[PDB]
Amino acid sequence: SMKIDVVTIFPEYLQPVRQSLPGKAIDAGLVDVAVHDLRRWTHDVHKSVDDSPYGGGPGMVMKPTVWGDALDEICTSETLLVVPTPAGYPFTQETAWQWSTEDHLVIACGRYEGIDQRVADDAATRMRVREVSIGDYVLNGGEAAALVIIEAVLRLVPGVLGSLLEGPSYTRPPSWRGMDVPPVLLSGDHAKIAAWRAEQSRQRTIERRPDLLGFDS
Amino acid sequence: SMKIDVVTIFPEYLQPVRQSLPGKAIDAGLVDVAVHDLRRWTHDVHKSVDDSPYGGGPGMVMKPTVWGDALDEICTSETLLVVPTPAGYPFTQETAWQWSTEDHLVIACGRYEGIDQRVADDAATRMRVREVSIGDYVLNGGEAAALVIIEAVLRLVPGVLSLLEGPSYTRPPSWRGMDVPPVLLSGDHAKIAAWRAEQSRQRTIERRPDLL
Numbered sequence: 001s002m003k004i005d006v007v008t009i010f011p012e013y014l015q016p017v018r019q020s021l022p023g024k025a026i027d028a029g030l031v032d033v034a035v036h037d038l039r040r041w042t043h044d045v046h047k048s049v050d051d052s053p054y055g056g057g058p059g060m061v062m063k064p065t066v067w068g069d070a071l072d073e074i075c076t077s078e079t080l081l082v083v084p085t086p087a088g089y090p091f092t093q094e095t096a097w098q099w100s101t102e103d104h105l106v107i108a109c110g111r112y113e114g115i116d117q118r119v120a121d122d123a124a125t126r127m128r129v130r131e132v133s134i135g136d137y138v139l140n141g142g143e144a145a146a147l148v149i150i151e152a153v154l155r156l157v158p159g160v161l162g163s164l165l166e167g168p169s170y171t172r173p174p175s176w177r178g179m180d181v182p183p184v185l186l187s188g189d190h191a192k193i194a195a196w197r198a199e200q201s202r203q204r205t206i207e208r209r210p211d212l213l214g215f216d217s
Numbered sequence: 218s219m220k221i222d223v224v225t226i227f228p229e230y231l232q233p234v235r236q237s238l239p240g241k242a243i244d245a246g247l248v249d250v251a252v253h254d255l256r257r258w259t260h261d262v263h264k265s266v267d268d269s270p271y272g273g274g275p276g277m278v279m280k281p282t283v284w285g286d287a288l289d290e291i292c293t294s295e296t297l298l299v300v301p302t303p304a305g306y307p308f309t310q311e312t313a314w315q316w317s318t319e320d321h322l323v324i325a326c327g328r329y330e331g332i333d334q335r336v337a338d339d340a341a342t343r344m345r346v347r348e349v350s351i352g353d354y355v356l357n358g359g360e361a362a363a364l365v366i367i368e369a370v371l372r373l374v375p376g377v378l379s380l381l382e383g384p385s386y387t388r389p390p391s392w393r394g395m396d397v398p399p400v401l402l403s404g405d406h407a408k409i410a411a412w413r414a415e416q417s418r419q420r421t422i423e424r425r426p427d428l429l
């Protein structure tokens with residue numbers, strides 16, 4: 001059993017976690033996902049979670065005080081605190097395997113132009129903290145990244161069932177709009193099919209992801 | 218104006234991003250995001266969307282006859298067909314910028330084992346098709362990837378939504394024994410810029426040496 005807490009100023013945005021694979025994991029009791037409104041830990045009437053940056057620059061920064069109070073309540077020393085950010089360490093399949101073994105993930109979703117760095121620095125004095133990027137593009141907030149991380153991790157947890165690129169796949173009918181399934185796939189020859197598939201995999205990889213094979217671009 | 222159509226067997230997945238669109242943008246007709254249940258285009262009483270893979274193996278492959286009908290109805294010659302797949306070309310910020318000026322994106326969400334490759338191959342004879350990955354990890358389905366692509370693209374459309382950035386700070390100046398770096402309070406803005414550049418350099422070396 002795993003616990004995932006998500007902290008966000010847009011809790012309704014995390015509703016998709018109830019769909020598809022994460023939803024099935026929740027229904028099967030293999031994970032408990034709880035979503036928390038960060039504004040619950042404010043004390044002013046405006047419920048302000050952001051302020052202008054020290055040193056200048058555009059936009060706003062999330063205040064450390066509100067985050068600190070929230071994480072104080074939700075986290076323990078055993079918690080793995082996950083903070084999505086474009087400036088993070090890369091989240092990869094290896095990360096997903098690693099986090100699939102964790103008892104408690106807390107995902108802190110940032111908005112505006114980022115979270116005051118002292119939040120992560122303070123948390124690291126009590127627990128493990130991982131600032132991570134899910135890809136080289138910029139989101140509007142950490143919530144979509146949270147959904148990506150949760151799905152990539154949960155599909156690996158024991159009980160939710162259990163390199164190179166996969167090549168093309170096909171199913172019935174064997175001919176469609178004048179396009180035929182590769183004959184080898186219809187031949188029933190396991191060795192020849194395995195060989196064709198291995199080849200298609202390496203060919204797609206050099207075209208789409210040459211970096212995976214140690215080439216430029 | 219941009220139109221985005223998403224096709225999925227989990228249409229409820231995309232409802233929060235639809236609701237997040239500012240009313241002013243919709244009213245001005247700058248953006249429209251529509252979601253379609255793939256099962257609308259199934260042929261049988263069981264509403265089948267997938268079938269066993271040719272050549273054997275685990276899992277299921279999504280049916281070309283169903284996807285073919287759905288894309289026939291939804292796409293036009295002007296469409297950029299986006300197909301999230303773990304085996305895709307990398308989706309990056311450059312991609313997001315390119316797609317932000319498109320008139321019509323259609324995103325086909327499928328299971329990770331794939332859509333029959335003839336769907337993309339056939340579509341590519343009539344429109345532009347882009348098979349893309351959003352990172353080096355595997356999801357079970359394309360819906361989360363669709364959410365990421367929609368967000369990254371629409372925040373670059375006006376009025377809708379190198380080195381790493383270094384740390385940011387705001388009030389209070391001291392918190393839990395940690396002070397904001399005094400240089401940021403110095404009023405020496407050339408020095409602040411130099412300090413930030415060094416912070417960015419160090420952070421990039423530590424977290425993303427690949428970028429250097």
Ligand SMILES: Nc1cc(-c2cccs2)n[nH]1
Nearest residue numbers: 085086134135139141142
């Ligand atoms: N990889 C990545 C993370 C993010 C964000 C996290 C929080 C706000 S934006 N964008 N792209």
Ligand SMILES: Nc1cc(-c2cccs2)n[nH]1
Nearest residue numbers: 301329351352356358359
């Ligand atoms: N980067 C990436 C894409 C995916 C998908 C899985 C299923 C459809 S798209 N996983 N990882």
